[PDB]
Amino acid sequence: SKLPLLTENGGRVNRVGFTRIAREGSIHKFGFFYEFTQESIDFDSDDGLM
C-alpha cells in the first residue's frame, strides 16, 4: 500500500526525508603523590629505595 508509483504526468508525488543524531563525551583529570624526608632516604639500610 505504501509503494512509490508514478504516471505519465509526473508531478509532486513522492517525497522523502532524512534525519541525523548526535553523540557526546567528556574529560576528567586524575593524579596522586607521596612525600618523603631526606634523612629517611639517607639513613635507610636499603640503597635503592627510590
Place this chain on the structure above:
Amino acid sequence: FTVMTKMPGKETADRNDPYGETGFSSIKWYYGILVKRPERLALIKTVAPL
C-alpha cells in the same frame, strides 16, 4: 521564424514537475506591410459561376 523546442529531460524539470516528462515546441514571427503608392494597385470585383 523563432523556434524554441524543449524535449523532456532535465531542461523541463521544475519544482512543479520534479520528474520532467512534459515538453513543447513553439514558433513566432513579426509581420507588417507599408504601401508606398496605392495608385498602382488595381482590383475588379465580380461574381463567379458555379
